[PDB]
């Protein structure tokens, strides 16, 4: 959880927002994947959000659906994911690493055991896409016991009772969504002492990063904009890094302001 606390402290002292890219581990391959993450970091990502390929991403869209496909087609497995995670951590000791998971991959080998390996590999937070706050108890307790921040999504259709629960159970950051007054949401979260909010809605242009930071968000998560480039340049790997590099610098520069 620490890595987040620290990050948010530094950004504040340099009055700037956090830029967080989302990428699928082992997309389009293991090595191409590690190469992609070093570039994101290098280019300016303040944190990472990584997905572990799951067979039925009942909460994801096609871009993300196709990413799991390519990873799978690559032979990526959860186990191979934990190996890659240990390598990333070994090269980048300070960047916060968050995982986006499906309940079943967490539950497979025991809930507690899953957070334990997270802890051992050096992951900072976990968001379980299909566990609402109402059913999170076993998930959040195991996370806290392993010093892992349990991340929760705050939906567009969120009420007060929920705002209250998310503020109280979450740590690291609050995942702010928009389903296809936020200033009030952000407001209400702050009021209840919720973890810093990261706007995840649909950040794809520097324009939106700047607006998020202005709205009151501590930064923004770029949910598939990155998966997009890999897709477009699947064809030319060198062209792939180059576009990513650029995109990230672009987005990061706009958080400053």
């Amino acid at each position: 959880m620490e890595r987040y606390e620290n990050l948010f402290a530094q950004l504040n002292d340099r009055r700037e927002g956090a830029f967080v890219p989302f990428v699928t581990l082992g997309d389009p391959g293991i090595e191409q994947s590690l190469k992609i993450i070093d570039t994101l970091i290098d280019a300016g990502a303040d944190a990472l959000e990584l997905g572990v390929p799951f067979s039925d991403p009942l909460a994801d869209g096609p871009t993300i659906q196709n990413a799991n496909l390519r990873a799978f087609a690559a032979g990526v497995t959860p186990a191979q994911c934990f190996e890659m995670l240990a390598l990333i951590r070994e090269k980048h000791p300070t960047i916060p690493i968050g995982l986006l998971m499906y309940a079943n991959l967490v539950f497979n080998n025991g809930i507690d055991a899953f957070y334990a390996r997270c802890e051992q590999v050096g992951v900072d937070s976990v968001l379980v896409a299909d566990v609402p706050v109402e059913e999170s108890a076993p998930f959040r307790q195991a996370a806290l016991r392993h010093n892992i921040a349990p991340i929760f999504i705050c939906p567009p259709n969120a009420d007060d009772d929920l705002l209250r629960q998310v503020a109280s159970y979450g740590r690291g950051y609050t995942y702010l969504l928009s389903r296809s007054p936020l200033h009030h949401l952000i407001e209400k979260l702050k009021e209840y002492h919720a973890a810093p909010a990261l706007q995840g809605f649909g950040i794809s242009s520097p324009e939106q990063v700047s607006a998020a930071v202005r709205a009151g968000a501590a930064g923004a998560i770029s949910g598939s904009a990155i998966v997009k480039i890999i897709e477009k340049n699947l064809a030319s790997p060198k062209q792939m890094l180059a576009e990513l590099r650029s995109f990230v610098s672009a987005m990061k520069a706009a958080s400053r302001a």
Binding site: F54, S55, D56, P57, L58, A59, G61, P62, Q65, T77, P78, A79, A103, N104, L105, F107, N108, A129, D130, V131, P132, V133, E134, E135, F152, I153, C154, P155, P156, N157, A158, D159, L162, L177, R179, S180
Partner: protein, 389 residues
């Protein structure tokens, strides 16, 4: 919640936070409907004047000859639409209206539920869209056409395995963004609370009627009631009313496919591991690292790779027993019913029939009163059995 979402440790509401409001709204509406005599009255009218209830309870004449077994078939194959799926689709379409929704989302595997959604929509005037894995669409043409004739929009799912699994995901994604105007008419007594409870309560007339029918004809309750189990709704509509009659056996039959040992089956309740998927905690078909897998069966409709939580629960406490029947055994029960009683059963229901035949053939001198739930008619299967033969 007003009701309990768990059956023992199985069940729950494992969905993205965005869908909770939809589930809560649905549960409230259901509880209110359930208490509304005007709702009860309208559901009953449609079941009787439109769908054809009550369905008959046929005593078999020739198949139990030389045995001390008496077999009765509950004829859901005589229901409008040709299967039990019609019962619940009507109460759901009525509940959708009660909430002021005007659209319907449904997922379908074999196409029976799809067809039933389309007919109910056509009749009560809702717009209907159906997700069907592209593989399923591709060899379910007859039911596809049938769906389009009734004015439903059929959307083939190409993602994942392009099978039922993938259709259920697409339907949840869709409902996510359109739940204010659309109602998700889920196909079986599975998924997130309150669906396992709603589908069972709208399928319980099967068992309620069977009970009254058998007391009238035999003056006693049956020794066992048997039903196939794909996701669990015909089985739970049959069993519900008997749960407290502890002398009555409850048997559910899952598809054994090519045989458990081969790994190609669809019997997660007895041969799979508990996991979390499709919004519930229950037994499912999965790899050792937790990826969801498909259920294999000769019968198209026993394709749900998991099972309802009340079933996983009835097994755990020993109230109901679950068995498996292979492809070959279902095909033989299909042919026997045809030639001896003149009834073409759905290959799904043939799994339950194969099991009652095994009970009587193994212990021919045991006196027993059995009831098999014939969930559908087999007209949709003559080509398959054909090309098998």
């Amino acid at each position: 919640t007003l009701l309990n979402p768990y059956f023992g440790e199985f069940g729950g509401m494992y969905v993205p936070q965005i869908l909770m409001p939809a589930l809560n709204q649905l549960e409230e509406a259901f509880v209110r409907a359930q208490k509304d005599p005007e709702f009860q009255a309208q559901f009953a009218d449609l079941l009787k004047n439109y769908a054809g209830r009550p369905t008959a309870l046929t005593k078999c004449q020739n198949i139990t000859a030389g045995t001390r077994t008496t077999l009765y078939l509950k004829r859901e194959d005589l229901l409008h639409g040709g299967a039990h799926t019609t019962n619940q689709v009507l109460g759901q379409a009525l509940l959708a209206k009660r909430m002021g929704k005007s659209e319907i989302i449904a997922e379908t595997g074999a196409g029976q539920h799809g067809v039933a959604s389309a007919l109910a929509s056509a009749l009560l005037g809702l717009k209907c869209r159906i997700y069907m894995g592209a593989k399923d669409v591709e060899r379910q043409s007859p039911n596809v056409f049938r769906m389009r004739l009734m004015g439903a929009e059929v959307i083939p799912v190409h993602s994942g395995s392009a099978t039922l699994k993938d259709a259920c995901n697409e339907a949840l994604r869709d409902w996510s963004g359109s739940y204010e105007t659309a109602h998700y008419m889920l196909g079986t007594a599975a998924g997130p609370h309150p669906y396992p409870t709603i589908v069972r309560e709208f399928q319980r007339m099967i068992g309620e009627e069977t009970k009254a029918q058998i007391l009238d004809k035999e003056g006693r309750l049956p020794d066992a009631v048997i039903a196939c189990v794909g996701g669990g709704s015909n089985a739970i509509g049959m069993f519900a009313d008997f749960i407290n009659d502890t002398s009555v056996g409850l048997i559910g039959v899952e598809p054994g496919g090519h045989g458990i040992e081969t790994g190609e089956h669809g019997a997660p309740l007895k041969h799979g591991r508990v996991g979390i998927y499709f919004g519930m905690k229950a037994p499912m078909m999965q790899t050792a690292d937790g990826q969801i897998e498909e259920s294999y069966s000769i019968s198209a409709g026993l394709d749900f790779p998991s099972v309802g939580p009340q079933h996983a629960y009835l097994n755990s406490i020993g109230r109901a027993d679950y068995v498996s029947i292979t492809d070959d055994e279902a095909l033989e029960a299909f042919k026997t019913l045809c030639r001896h009683e003149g009834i073409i059963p759905a290959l799904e229901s043939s799994h339950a029939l194969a099991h009652a035949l095994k009970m009587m053939r193994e212990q021919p001198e045991k006196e027993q009163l059995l009831v098999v739930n014939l969930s559908g008619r087999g007209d949709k299967d003559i080509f398959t059995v054909h090309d098998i033969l």
